[PDB]
Design an enzyme around this catalytic site. Structure first.
Site, PDB file in Angstrom:
ATOM      1  N   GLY A   1      -9.364 -12.139  -2.216  1.00 54.66           N
ATOM      2  CA  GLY A   1     -10.628 -11.432  -2.315  1.00 54.66           C
ATOM      3  C   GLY A   1     -10.708 -10.399  -1.211  1.00 54.66           C
ATOM      4  O   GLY A   1      -9.693  -9.821  -0.829  1.00 54.66           O
TER       5      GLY A   1
ATOM      6  N   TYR B   1      -0.586  -4.478  -4.660  1.00 51.79           N
ATOM      7  CA  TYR B   1      -1.581  -3.452  -4.969  1.00 51.79           C
ATOM      8  C   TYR B   1      -1.369  -2.236  -4.071  1.00 51.79           C
ATOM      9  O   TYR B   1      -1.489  -1.096  -4.520  1.00 51.79           O
ATOM     10  CB  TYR B   1      -2.994  -3.997  -4.764  1.00 51.79           C
TER      11      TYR B   1
ATOM     12  N   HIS C   1      -0.083 -10.510  -3.641  1.00 55.77           N
ATOM     13  CA  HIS C   1      -0.881  -9.724  -4.582  1.00 55.77           C
ATOM     14  C   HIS C   1      -1.496  -8.510  -3.880  1.00 55.77           C
ATOM     15  O   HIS C   1      -1.488  -7.404  -4.426  1.00 55.77           O
ATOM     16  CB  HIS C   1      -1.982 -10.601  -5.187  1.00 55.77           C
ATOM     17  N   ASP C   2      -2.026  -8.704  -2.673  1.00 56.72           N
ATOM     18  CA  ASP C   2      -2.616  -7.585  -1.936  1.00 56.72           C
ATOM     19  C   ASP C   2      -1.552  -6.531  -1.602  1.00 56.72           C
ATOM     20  O   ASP C   2      -1.802  -5.334  -1.702  1.00 56.72           O
ATOM     21  CB  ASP C   2      -3.278  -8.062  -0.634  1.00 56.72           C
TER      22      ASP C   2
ATOM     23  N   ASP D   1      -0.905  -8.501 -11.106  1.00 58.15           N
ATOM     24  CA  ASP D   1      -1.894  -9.473 -11.575  1.00 58.15           C
ATOM     25  C   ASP D   1      -1.296 -10.703 -12.256  1.00 58.15           C
ATOM     26  O   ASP D   1      -1.708 -11.833 -11.979  1.00 58.15           O
ATOM     27  CB  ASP D   1      -2.892  -8.797 -12.527  1.00 58.15           C
TER      28      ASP D   1
ATOM     29  N   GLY E   1     -10.306  -8.797   2.035  1.00 60.15           N
ATOM     30  CA  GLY E   1      -9.494  -9.149   3.185  1.00 60.15           C
ATOM     31  C   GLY E   1      -8.115  -8.545   3.075  1.00 60.15           C
ATOM     32  O   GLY E   1      -7.826  -7.863   2.086  1.00 60.15           O
TER      33      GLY E   1
ATOM     34  N   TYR F   1      -4.977  -1.971 -18.135  1.00 56.29           N
ATOM     35  CA  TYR F   1      -3.638  -2.128 -18.683  1.00 56.29           C
ATOM     36  C   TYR F   1      -3.697  -2.943 -19.975  1.00 56.29           C
ATOM     37  O   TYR F   1      -4.748  -3.463 -20.357  1.00 56.29           O
ATOM     38  CB  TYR F   1      -2.715  -2.817 -17.664  1.00 56.29           C
TER      39      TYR F   1
ATOM     40  N   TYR G   1      -6.502 -13.767   2.664  1.00 53.13           N
ATOM     41  CA  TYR G   1      -6.119 -12.723   1.719  1.00 53.13           C
ATOM     42  C   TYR G   1      -6.765 -12.718   0.336  1.00 53.13           C
ATOM     43  O   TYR G   1      -6.802 -11.675  -0.319  1.00 53.13           O
ATOM     44  CB  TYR G   1      -4.595 -12.732   1.561  1.00 53.13           C
TER      45      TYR G   1
END
Length: 119
Positions: free
Chosen positions: A29, A51, A47-48, A93, A31, A67, A27
């Site tokens: 980067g 998003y 995190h993915d 983030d 992927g 932001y 996951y």
């Protein structure tokens, strides 16, 4: 945006290059599939997913949204000067940068074969 996320990582993980998190496990980067290989990878999965959720907001593009945040004296903060989209990605983030700082880094999970191990 990505530039800002890179800086957050440099804020919480000074003893490491952001490149180390740019291609790790299934996951981190490029992927987004398969079983997370370890804690650090789970940080990136969350995190993915975060998003993907933020992208449901009209005109919100996580990779490019600028932001307002601050990184001073060991503390990472998202300011109240952010609209809904900015506030959401900043939080995605910030939580990831914090997660990265408390997760063990296994060199043996860097740049793994995604097509063979992330199904």
């Amino acid at each position: 945006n990505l530039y800002q996320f890179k800086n957050m990582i440099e804020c919480t993980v000074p003893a490491r290059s952001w490149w180390d998190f740019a291609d790790y496990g299934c996951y981190c980067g490029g992927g987004g599939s398969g079983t997370p290989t370890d804690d650090l990878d789970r940080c990136c999965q969350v995190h993915d997913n975060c998003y993907n959720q933020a992208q449901e907001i009209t005109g919100c593009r996580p990779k490019w949204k600028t932001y307002t945040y601050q990184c001073t004296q060991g503390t990472l903060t998202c300011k109240g000067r952010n609209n809904s989209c900015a506030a959401t990605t900043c939080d995605c983030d910030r939580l990831a940068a914090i997660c990265f700082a408390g997760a063990p880094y296994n060199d043996t999970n860097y740049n793994i074969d995604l097509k063979a191990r992330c199904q």
